[PDB]
Amino acid sequence: LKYTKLIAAAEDGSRSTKDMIDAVFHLRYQPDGVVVHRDDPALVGK
Amino acid sequence: FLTNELIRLQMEKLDAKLNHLKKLEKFMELERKTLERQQENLLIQRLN
Amino acid sequence: THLLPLQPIEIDYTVRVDKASTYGELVLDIEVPDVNALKFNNTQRESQIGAA
User: Fold this and answer.
1) Which residue numbers in chain A precede an interruption (C–N > 2.5 Å)?
2) Phi and psi for B9 in degrees, rounded to 5?
């Protein structure tokens, strides 16, 4: 199957967070439904 | 002569079902896709 | 009874009097439903295709 190696690598302890998500993802993802930027260095450039 | 006639009739009968096997073979592709979708969900929930 | 209808987003925001422009500081991103995808999905379900 398609994700049989990405699934195995997830729970074996390797690729704990960033390695895995970047392996999956074209699509856009945000770390949550609601993301608030109280203060941002790049966004204050407007 | 009659035995040869029988054999021909039986082979003709087998051919139809051997053809009917292919649609049942396509339902397997359906099941395969559904399994991969369930795997998508499991992966993303583990990452969550 | 425990299940409840969609709750709203709460933010605390302070007006800035000396800070003339407060434009780019508070930017918040939310996700909204895509009705077209929901409609294309619920009419193409494993149950319906299997029945077909």
Assistant:
1) 25
2) -60, -40
d(C-alpha B28, C-alpha B32), whole Å? 6
Residue B4, judged by CB atoms within 10 A of its CB (0-12, 13-18, 19+), counts as exposed
Resolution (A): 2.9
For C13, nearest residue in chain A (alpha carbons): A38
Phi, psi of C40 (to 5 degrees): -70, -25
Chain C contact for A27 (CB, 8 A cutoff):
no
User: How was this one solved?
Assistant: cryo-EM
Task: Give the bridge partners for A36, in sequence order.
Answer: C28
- Residue C3's SS3 state is coil
